[model samples]
Target: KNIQVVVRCRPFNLAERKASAHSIVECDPVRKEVSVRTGGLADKSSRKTYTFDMVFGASTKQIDVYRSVVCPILDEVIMGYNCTIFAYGQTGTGKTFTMEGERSPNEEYTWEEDPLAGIIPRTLHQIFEKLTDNGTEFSVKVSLLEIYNEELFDLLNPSSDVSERLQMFDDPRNKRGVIIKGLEEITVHNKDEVYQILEKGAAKRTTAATLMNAYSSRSHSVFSVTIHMKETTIDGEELVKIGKLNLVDLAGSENNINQSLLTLGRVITALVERTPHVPYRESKLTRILQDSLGGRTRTSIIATISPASLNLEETLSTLEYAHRAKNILNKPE
Candidate 1:
C-alpha cells in the first residue's frame, strides 16, 4: 500500500567539478539511508538523515538502480495493474539522467551497454521481451505530453503547438478516470520503434538553459505506455487485460513554477494525512498523476539530489518532499 521511494545521488558534473564544490551529502547504501551535513568539514551537529526503500550513491550504476528499484514495478504492470515511475528533484540533480539517459553514439543501446540506458528504455525492452516470451498477443500504445505554464501539449503531435491547450474530461462512466482531449496515442511494436517515437517526442519537449542546469526541463513530461494483452487460461479460455505504465519526468523543484510544484507537494501531504480531500485537480501535473497517487496504482519515486554543498537548500527541500511522499499509502488492487 505504501509508495516506494528511493534516493539517488548523482555524481558531480563538469560545472560542479570545475568550481570544486564541497561535498555536503553522504549516503549509506547498506542501510538505505542518506544524510546531509550543515556547514563545512568541521560541522556535525546539524547533520540530517533520511531513510528510504532504497538508496543509490553517486557511484551507483544506472542498471543497478533500475534493477533494484523499478523492476518490481514493471512486474506489476505486466500483470494488468497500472504503475508510475517518477523522477523528482531540483534542477541539474539528474532527473533527466535517471529518466531518459543521454543518447548513445549509435543512437541505439545494446544490452552490453546497459549502464548507459535509463529506466524508460530498459522498461520498454523488458515489456517486449516478457510478452513475446510468453507467446502473448499484445498491442502497445504510447502517448507523450508535457505540461508547461498550466497548459498541456501533446509532444507526439508535431503539428500541434503549445497554444493548442488540451482539455481534461472527467469520465462519467467511471471506467477510465480523467481523459485528456486531443492527445495522440501512437501504437508501437518493438523496442526500436518505441525509441524512435521517444526520440521524436523528446526533441519537442520544452527545455532551456538555466542558472542551475544548462539543459533544464522547463515542463513536466509524461510518457505513458499502455499495453493490452490476451492471456490464455489453463482451461483453454482467453482473457484480456489492459495495463498502463506512466514514466514522469518532472520539472526542477527550484524553478519558478513554484506554484504548480507547491500544489503537488500539498497533494502529497493530503494523501499522507489521509485527509478527506486530495487535491488531484490542483495542477495539470497532479491531475495527470491522479491515478498514480493515493489510488489503485503501483508507484515508485526516484528522488535525485546533488551532493554539492552549494546546493544544500535545494537538497534539503527535495529530501523533505520525498520524505512526505514515501508515507503516502494507496489502495492497490
Candidate 2:
C-alpha cells in the first residue's frame, strides 16, 4: 500500500497565462482518472487516458494534496518504518510548489494559515505532533544533499564546492548497500529548528533560468529525516528503533532526456525485473536512492505535469515514467 503513484495538475501561472497556453489535462477526481489530449481540442483519436491511485485537479489546495498523499506516509514513519516520497515532472510544473511551497523569508507560517505550506513543512508539523501525543522520548537528525550534473554536493555545507564531488561508499555489512561519505547530519529538536535547517540548505540548491520556466531546478535534492525512538521494556531493558523519511525533489525530467532520464529508466527496469545486478551504480541520484527503490523503504511518487499543448511530449514522457515506477514492488518491513 505504500508504493502509491499520484498525479497533480497545477493552475496556470503568470507565464502560462501570458502565453495563452491551453489546458490539455482533464482529471476526474471522483474516478481518479486523468486523460491527456495530444493534438487538438476536437481530436478524440489523440487522447490517452491513465488511472492512478489518486489525482488532484488544478484548483486543489496544497494542504489537501499533502493530506491525501503524504500524511499517511508520515504516520507510518513514527511506527519505525522507512518511507520515501519523490516528485517527478517536467519544468514549470508544480513539483517544487507541491513539495516546497512559496514560503517567503519574512513570512510566518502556522497551522491555522497552512494554505501556502507544502508537504515537507506539513509533515514536520505532523511528526512532532504525533511524537508529543505518544509522549515518547525521541531524537531527530536531518541531512540535505543534492545531485547536480551527476555529482553529489552537501547542501547543508556552504563551503562544499561543486567540484569536490562526494563519493558513494559501500556498506560493509551489506554488499548491495551504498552510503554517501562525508554527508553532514544535523541534530534537530523541534519543528521550528527543522524549518530553519531546511531553509538554510534549500538556499544552496542549484537553480537556473530555463527556456520553459524561470528558476528551474538543475539538481535533484534529498532532505533526509532520521528519527530514533527510545523506549524501556518491561524487564528494564532500553531499546531504540530507527525510522527514516526521504523527501526527494527531483530535477525536471525533460532536462536530460537521453542521458540521466534514460539511466533512471534502466535502473527502474532492473528494479521491477528484480535483477541481481540492479545497476544502481550508474547514476549518483539512483545510487543514493538504492535503499528507497529496491530495498525495504516504502516509496511514493508525485508525478506533476504541464497541460499546455507545447509540453505534450514531455507530459506523455512523465506519465510513462510514473507508470514504470508504480510497478516496482518493494517488500518493506
Candidate 3:
C-alpha cells in the first residue's frame, strides 16, 4: 500500500472534431505503464515508457479512482478532519474535471446514479458514521466557495448575483489571519442535501465559464467540511476539537496561470532555495494559503496528465512541477 504518485490520461472531450489531431501518449492500467512517442505520429518506434504507482487510461471511469485512491485518502483526512487536500495539474488536463465532473463528450457520465464523481461526492458518504436518531446529533456542515481572477466568492450565497462579491480582511484577534464576511456554511443532515448545495455551486461556475470566459475559468474551489463532535474528558468534562477539512480543486497551470500557480511555484522555490522573502503578496491564492504553507497541512497534490502528444510539454511540466513539491519536507505543526 505504498501509494504515492499516479497519472491520469484525459480522453477526448466532445467538440475537438477538427478533422484529425492524433493520439501520442499510451497507457496500460493493468500493468500501470505509460508510453509516449518521442517523435510524432509516424515515430511509433520511439516509444519512451514510464510507470507510476498506478495509471488511469482514457477509458478509466470515476469510480475506479474514487474507490481506489480518493476513498482511502479521505478516511485519514476525516481522521485528521483538520487539514487541506488538493488536485493540481496543467490547464485543461482535467484537474477540476477530476474534482467534481467535467464535460462528458458523449453526454453520459454515470457509472451509477449521478454518473461519476470526484472526491466531493464520495467524501460525504464515508464521514456519515454518527448519523441517525440514536441520539447522535452533530453538525456535519458544508460550504462551497470559489476563487477566480484573484477574488474569493462565497458561492453558496445567493447574493453573489447582486453585486455579491465577498471580502476577506485581516482578523484583529488572530495574527496574519483573515476571514470572509458572511460566508454561508450550510448545515446538511445528509449527503444528498449536501449534494444539492454543490449543484448550485457547480451551476454558478457553469455560467461563470461564459462570463469569465478565456483560460479555462481560472478558479480554485474550496469545498469545506465542518464536523463537530462531542467527547468526555478524564475529569468528566465534555469538549470538542474544532476539526474541519478543505478539499480544493486548484487553478490549473497554463495560459496566464501565474497569478496563483506561478507565485505558488515561486513561493515553493523560495522555500526550497531557503530564501528569506517569499512572494505571498503577489496573488490571492498563495496569500490565502500562506499561513498553512509551512506546517501540518502536509499537502499531497493529485497531479493530472494527458495522453495526447499535442500537450506533451504540459504533461512533462506537470510531472516536473509535482516532483519539486516532494522536496519540501514537513514538520508537525
Q: What is the C-alpha lDDT of each candidate?
A: 0.81, 0.78, 0.67
Comparing 2 with 3 on lDDT, the higher-scoring candidate is 2
lDDT comparing candidate 1 with the true structure: 0.81
Q: List model 2 lDDT by residue over 134-251, tens digit each.
A: 6468988878777766667777765664345688787898865777898878888887776677666656544222212332456777888899998777788887778899998888
Query: TM-score for each prediction?
Result: 0.91, 0.88, 0.80
- Residues forming the 10-long window of minimal summed lDDT in candidate 2: 206-215
Query: Model 3 reaches what TM-score against the true structure?
Result: 0.80
List the pairs of residues colliding in candidate 2: none
lDDT of 1 at 277: 89
lDDT of 1 by residue, 1-333 (tens): 799999999998888889987678889988989999966457344788999988998988888977897788888887899999999998888888888776566747554355677888778877887777785789988888777677777878767754577888887777437789999999887766866777667556543222123234557878898999897888989998888999999878883654457788888988888789888777878877887888888899999999888788899989988988998887776
Put down candidate 3 lDDT per residue, 204-277, tens digits, no spaces. Answer: 76666666745244777788888776656668786654456677787777546447767788977887677789
- Ranking of candidates on TM-score, top first: 1, 2, 3
lDDT of 3: 0.67
For all predictions, the C-alpha RMSD in Å is 3.1, 3.3, 4.1
- Candidate 3, residue 138: the lDDT equals 56
Error of 1 at 126 (Å): 1.5
Instruction: Using lDDT as the measure, name the better of candidate 1 and candidate 2.
Output: 1
